[PDB]
Amino acid sequence: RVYIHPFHLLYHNKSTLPESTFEPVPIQAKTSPVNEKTLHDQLVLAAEKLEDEDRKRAAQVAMITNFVGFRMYKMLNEAGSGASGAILSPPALFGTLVSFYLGSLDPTASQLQTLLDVPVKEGDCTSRLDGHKVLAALRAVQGLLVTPLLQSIVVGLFTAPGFRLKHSFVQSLALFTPALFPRSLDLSTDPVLATEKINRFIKAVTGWKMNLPLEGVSTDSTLLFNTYVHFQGTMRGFSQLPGVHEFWVDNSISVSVPMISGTGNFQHWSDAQNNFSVTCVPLGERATLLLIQPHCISDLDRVEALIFQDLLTWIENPPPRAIRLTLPQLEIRGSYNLQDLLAEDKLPTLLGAEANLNNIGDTNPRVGEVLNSILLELKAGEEEQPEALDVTLSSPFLFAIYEQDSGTLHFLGRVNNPQ
Amino acid sequence: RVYIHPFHLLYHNKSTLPESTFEPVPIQAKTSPVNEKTLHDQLVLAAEKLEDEDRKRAAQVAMITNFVGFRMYKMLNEAGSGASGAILSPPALFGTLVSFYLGSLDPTASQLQTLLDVPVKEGDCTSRLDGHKVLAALRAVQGLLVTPLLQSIVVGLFTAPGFRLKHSFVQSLALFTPALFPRSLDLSTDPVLATEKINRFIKAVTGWKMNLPLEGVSTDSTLLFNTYVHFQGTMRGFSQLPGVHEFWVDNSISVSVPMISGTGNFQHWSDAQNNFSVTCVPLGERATLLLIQPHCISDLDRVEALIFQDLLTWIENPPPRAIRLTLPQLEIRGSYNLQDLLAEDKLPTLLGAEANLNNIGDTNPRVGEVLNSILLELKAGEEEQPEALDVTLSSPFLFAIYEQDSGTLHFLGRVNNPQ
Numbered sequence: 158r159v160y161i162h163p164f165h166l167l168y169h170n171k172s173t174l175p176e177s178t179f180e181p182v183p184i185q186a187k188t189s190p191v192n193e194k195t196l197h198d199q200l201v202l203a204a205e206k207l208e209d210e211d212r213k214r215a216a217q218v219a220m221i222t223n224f225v226g227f228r229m230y231k232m233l234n235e236a237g238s239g240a241s242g243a244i245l246s247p248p249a250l251f252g253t254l255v256s257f258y259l260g261s262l263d264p265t266a267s268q269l270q271t272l273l274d275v276p277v278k279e280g281d282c283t284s285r286l287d288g289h290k291v292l293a294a295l296r297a298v299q300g301l302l303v304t305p306l307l308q309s310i311v312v313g314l315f316t317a318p319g320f321r322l323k324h325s326f327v328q329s330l331a332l333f334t335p336a337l338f339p340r341s342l343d344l345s346t347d348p349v350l351a352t353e354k355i356n357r358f359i360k361a362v363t364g365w366k367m368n369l370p371l372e373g374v375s376t377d378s379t380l381l382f383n384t385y386v387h388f389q390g391t392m393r394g395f396s397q398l399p400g401v402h403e404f405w406v407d408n409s410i411s412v413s414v415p416m417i418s419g420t421g422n423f424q425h426w427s428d429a430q431n432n433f434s435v436t437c438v439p440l441g442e443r444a445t446l447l448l449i450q451p452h453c454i455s456d457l458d459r460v461e462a463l464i465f466q467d468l469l470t471w472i473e474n475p476p477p478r479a480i481r482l483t484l485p486q487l488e489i490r491g492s493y494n495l496q497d498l499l500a501e502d503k504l505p506t507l508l509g510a511e512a513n514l515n516n517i518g519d520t521n522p523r524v525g526e527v528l529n530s531i532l533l534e535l536k537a538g539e540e541e542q543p544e545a546l547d548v549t550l551s552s553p554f555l556f557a558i559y560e561q562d563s564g565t566l567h568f569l570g571r572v573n574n575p576q
Numbered sequence: 577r578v579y580i581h582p583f584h585l586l587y588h589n590k591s592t593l594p595e596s597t598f599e600p601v602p603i604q605a606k607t608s609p610v611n612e613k614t615l616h617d618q619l620v621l622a623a624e625k626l627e628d629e630d631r632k633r634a635a636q637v638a639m640i641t642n643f644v645g646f647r648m649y650k651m652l653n654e655a656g657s658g659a660s661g662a663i664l665s666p667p668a669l670f671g672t673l674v675s676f677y678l679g680s681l682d683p684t685a686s687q688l689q690t691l692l693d694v695p696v697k698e699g700d701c702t703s704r705l706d707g708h709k710v711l712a713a714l715r716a717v718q719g720l721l722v723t724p725l726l727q728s729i730v731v732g733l734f735t736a737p738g739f740r741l742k743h744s745f746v747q748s749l750a751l752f753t754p755a756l757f758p759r760s761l762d763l764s765t766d767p768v769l770a771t772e773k774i775n776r777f778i779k780a781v782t783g784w785k786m787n788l789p790l791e792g793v794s795t796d797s798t799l800l801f802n803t804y805v806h807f808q809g810t811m812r813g814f815s816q817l818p819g820v821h822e823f824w825v826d827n828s829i830s831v832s833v834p835m836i837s838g839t840g841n842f843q844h845w846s847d848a849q850n851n852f853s854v855t856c857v858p859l860g861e862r863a864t865l866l867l868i869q870p871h872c873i874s875d876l877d878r879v880e881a882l883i884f885q886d887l888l889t890w891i892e893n894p895p896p897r898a899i900r901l902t903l904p905q906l907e908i909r910g911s912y913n914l915q916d917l918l919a920e921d922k923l924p925t926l927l928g929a930e931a932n933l934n935n936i937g938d939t940n941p942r943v944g945e946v947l948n949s950i951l952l953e954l955k956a957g958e959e960e961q962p963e964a965l966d967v968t969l970s971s972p973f974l975f976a977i978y979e980q981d982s983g984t985l986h987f988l989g990r991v992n993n994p995q
């Protein structure tokens with residue numbers, strides 16, 4: 158029975174030419190690849206010129222982001238995320254939802270806000286989220302995160318030939334990420350080839366090897382909204398160990414995988430109440446990798462449901478200590494359709510055919526997939542060539558990436574089998 | 577051989593989705609009338625939050641505005657402005673030209689800048705005017721002027737059915753005035769009726785009785801750009817005198833017209849060198865009416881050519897003195913086609929059929945008329961119910977309205993016959 162009241166993210170006072178449109182260029186059209194460094198430098202500036210007001214908006218956006226992330230993570234696990242584990246980016250999902258919110262009118266608008274856990278007072282427009290404020294706060298926490306440390310979000314907006322996008326909608330989207338690619342293509346004749354073209358396009362414009370889904374697009378789709386997230390962070394002072402080392406996928410089965418290892422002054426503790434432990438490794442001045450180990454493999458589900466389901470009161474802050482950390486080199490790929498997660502959440506028609514998204518384009522779109530896809534890379538900072546506590550991740554565990562100032566969780570996940 | 581070097585109005589560093597467009601609604605579509613008070617309050621805010629930088633940009637914009645105003649005033653008189661006299665609004669003309677500049681590409685762009693007396697260095701984009709800076713400085717001097725004192729500029733942008741305007745162009749225009757009315761109508765079948773519809777539209781949306789030209793629009797026109805200016809100022813302490821009083825239209829002919837009269841501490845002097853005199857009456861805290869009388873009627877042309885043709889070094893600043901000023905109540909209406917003034921200036925094809933205005937819409941427009949039309953009203957501040965110098969305007973004279981801080985001339989003109 159929880160409710161978030163993000164005052165600083167609402168409209169505050171209750172108060173016209175025809176809207177301009179364009180037609181996106183075909184998906185075939187030659188496009189320069191995304192520059193991740195450029196993106197990174199932009200994001201860092203947005204974070205560097207923050208007022209107190211901005212910090213307040215950022216703390217409120219973190220609350221909305223985290224809550225919907227935990228909720229959708231739960232939905233993902235209910236639906237089944239595959240063998241290797243699970244990964245979800247609350248910022249990316251939240252941004253996707255806020256983008257639809259900006260393109261939506263009631264009843265869809267209010268339903269989206271209700272899903273974000275913010276009360277709506279019918280008749281009262283000053284009770285509504287200001288999506289531009291929201292996306293501006295979300296950009297700022299993206300920047301705070303990355304103060305060689307990369308977080309790139311690119312959006313593929315794929316539309317049927319002849320569907321025209323509203324300028325205002327697309328300009329709103331740029332606040333989510335400037336790496337935005339509206340492209341048209343035939344979605345009505347060969348769904349599987351359309352997905353091939355989309356997957357080929359994204360790989361060419363990003364250079365990321367993401368292992369994207371192959372399933373075809375529904376033939377009546379006029380609009381797809383796909384969000385692609387690349388996170389890269391270097392583990393300073395970590396190097397790959399020689400050889401291969403047993404990783405227990407369960408109590409009777411092991412895989413022998415490459416491990417990285419390093420010693421630093423990290424935070425670590427054991428939660429007595431629920432019998433798990435946590436280790437925190439800094440990834441930058443504001444970014445923290447949390448690594449959560451259950452006491453035994455069969456307790457993983459209980460621990461995961463506990464720590465990932467709203468205020469992270471489980472995050473403690475002990476004095477750092479000398480820890481030798483050993484863990485699998487993490488190269489994590491995941492993808493889901495937000496449509497499926499919404500259906501799992503008993504909201505199958507929220508972005509359905511009757512959704513009012515009349516502020517997206519010149520006609521109401523028919524939304525096909527809304528994909529969120531991730532490539533997360535935790536690289537060893539040193540090439541493979543002192544008393545400390547040994548922490549060794551050689552059975553399934555949970556992880557989160559966390560921004561200290563706002564408290565935004567940028568990723569949450571579970572590793573069952575690192576490959 | 578004069579040149580203006582407005583550094584603060586140039587682009588400074590030498591450094592994409594399809595452009596969005598809309599189709600203007602038909603001229604028949606129901607429209608609320610312009611609110612002059614609302615406009616006035618907006619303009620006053622823009623003037624109230626000015627930095628030093630803004631003041632520098634405003635002083636440079638005044639120079640460009642005044643120079644093109646004097647030049648076009650000369651062209652107007654060469655072409656013949658009718659019987660009653662002449663009136664021209666440099667800000668309105670300048671804003672019209674800067675608006676075309678924003679919609680233009682080379683060679684038209686550079687030709688427009690050259691007409692504004694600012695050097696162009698081919699290959700060097702940092703030598704170009706930044707039209708957004710320019711229009712932002714022009715808005716600020718509009719506001720400074722009006723700190724019951726009104727200066728309203730409304731723009732009628734009339735386009736052939738099916739011609740689509742670029743969002744970016746129209747957004748640029750809003751910086752000139754937010755009172756902007758893009759409307760479509762058939763220009764190809766009945767030119768005279770089209771002008772009737774335009775004239776009817778402007779009167780309905782403004783309430784101003786302007787006595788607009790009746791001549792038809794050329795049949796191949798796809799775009800008309802008409803600017804309409806209403807100035808209203810109250811002469812504090814002036815009241816209409818009883819009866820009618822002789823006004824000499826020349827040495828042998830008089831008309832008996834109503835006069836207003838009032839006594840105040842105004843500035844006044846005689847220019848010995850060229851044998852004319854000037855009186856300055858404040859209209860607000862920053863606005864000044866200048867009234868220039870030749871010594872005799874036959875010298876008017878020489879005096880007009882002298883004072884209106886670049887730095888107003890003729891404007892003096894003596895201590896004010898007790899003056900009884902008597903003059904005709906001024907209700908001045910004027911209209912010209914900037915196309916005609918450009919032709920008079922030997923630039924007939926500058927906004928001609930080969931003009932590159934490809935940033936205005938989805939096709940290159942064919943520009944018909946570019947009208948500037950004025951209604952200037954100087955009302956007596958008191959209803960008709962002490963030693964001073966008598967100044968009485970009972971023969972032809974010149975007038976200007978002038979903003980003190982920037983030195984922008986908002987109007988210049990000549991009265992031969994007040995009605």
Ligand code: NA
Pocket residue numbers: 164165166210
């Ligand atoms: Na606020």
Ligand code: NA
Pocket residue numbers: 175176177324325743
């Ligand atoms: Na718009």
Ligand code: NA
Pocket residue numbers: 213
């Ligand atoms: Na607060």
Ligand code: NA
Pocket residue numbers: 258259286287288289
């Ligand atoms: Na909004």
Ligand code: NA
Pocket residue numbers: 583584585629
């Ligand atoms: Na400047």
Ligand code: NA
Pocket residue numbers: 324594595596743744
């Ligand atoms: Na645009």
Ligand code: NA
Pocket residue numbers: 632
């Ligand atoms: Na200067």
Ligand code: NA
Pocket residue numbers: 677678705706707708
């Ligand atoms: Na410009």
